[PDB]
Amino acid sequence: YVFESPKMKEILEKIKKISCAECPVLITGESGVGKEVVARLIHKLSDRSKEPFVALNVASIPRDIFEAELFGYEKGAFTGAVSSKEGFFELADGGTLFLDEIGELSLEAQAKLLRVIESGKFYRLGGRKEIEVNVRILAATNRNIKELVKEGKFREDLYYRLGVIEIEIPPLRERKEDIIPLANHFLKKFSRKYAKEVEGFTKSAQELLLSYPWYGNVRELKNVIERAVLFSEGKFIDRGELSCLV
């Protein structure tokens, strides 16, 4: 990974300092800024470096089977319970659990989440033995959680538990010092990956990168660079190729 902006350097120093503590960590920012990158950096420098890093997104979780993913189930608990399954809390036993897009969780299921965090013990669906696990919680959000709380769309206890230490990542629109390093890194990486000689962007094309108000941020930048490399026919990338996408 590449970090050059002063804000990114400050965030890196903060991540270095907070890796020792085991308190839950919340990260917020716009889409495609690198929240998962920061979470993985925290996990790597933490005392649980060799432990599993279980990352999951709650947006793709169906409403009516959330418990089956929260606790897991044993064999034959219900129709379709072919074999035993482990919930994400049991998967990350000793490791770190990373919940992405926590702000879109339904109100009813939220009350069912922190209840397992504070107690620390749960029963598998169809299981008659009690399971005790220890997990470090990292959470990611895209919107403002405080405004959601003021609208009654979020639990304040869950915010207090998750918001022990919270981090804000500046979007790429205000990190213009990373545009050229990220573009060059992606260019070299994808040029090696697809095995075709592309040296670097022309001077004319460089100003287009700054002039572009990136809305998809790093994800959009990476996709654009990869597509430009795929269609590239020379070692120098001109502004004409980039202008087709933007």
Ligand X SMILES: Nc1ncnc2c1ncn2[C@@H]1O[C@H](COP(=O)(O)OP(=O)(O)OP(=O)(O)O)[C@@H](O)[C@H]1O
Ligand Y SMILES: Nc1ncnc2c1ncn2[C@@H]1O[C@H](COP(=O)(O)OP(=O)(O)O)[C@@H](O)[C@H]1O
The contact set with ligand Y (CB under 6 A) reads 1-3, 31-37, 218-219, 222
Q: Does 179 bind a second copy (CB under 8 A)?
A: no
- Cα 152 vs. chain centroid, distance in angstroms? 25
35 belongs to an annotated ligand binding site: yes
Q: Is the dihedral of CA 41, 43, 46, 49 positive or negative?
A: negative
Cβ 102 vs Cβ 154: under 8 Å: no
Q: Which residue's CB is nearer to ligand Y, number 34 or number 72?
A: 34
144 belongs to an annotated ligand binding site: no
User: Which listed residue (24, 32, 72, 95) binds ligand X by CB under 6 A?
Assistant: 32
Per DSSP, which regions of 30-181 are E strands? 53-57, 72-73, 85-86, 96-100, 121-123, 130-132, 136-141, 165-169
* Residues in region 145-164 near ligand X by CB under 6 A: 157
* Residues in region 108-167 near a second copy by CB under 8 A: 108, 111-112, 114-115, 118, 122-123, 125-126, 128, 142, 152, 155-157, 160-161, 163-165
User: Which listed residue (5, 142, 184, 206) binds ligand X by CB under 6 A?
Assistant: 142
A 10 A CB-CB count for 40 gives: 17
User: Which listed residue (6, 144, 177, 231) binds a second copy by CB under 8 A?
Assistant: 231
**Closest separation between CB of residue 158 and other proteins, Å?**
23
* Residues in region 94-123 near ligand X by CB under 6 A: 100, 114
Cβ 183 vs Cβ 221: under 8 Å: yes
Residue 157 contact partner, candidates ligand X, ligand Y, other proteins, none, CB within 5 to 8 A by sort of partner: ligand X
- Give CA–CA dist 46/180, Å, rounded: 31
- Give CA–CA dist 53/76, Å, rounded: 29
Residue 34 contact partner, candidates other proteins, Mg ion, ligand Y, none, CB within 5 to 8 A by sort of partner: ligand Y
* Residues in region 96-135 near Mg ion by CB under 5 A: 100
- Give CA–CA dist 178/32, Å, rounded: 14
Q: Is the dihedral of CA 193, 194, 200, 203 positive or negative?
A: negative
Chain residues binding ligand X by CB under 6 A are 1-3, 29, 31-37, 100, 114, 140, 142, 157, 185, 218-219, 222
Tell me the binding residues for Mg(2+).
36, 100-101
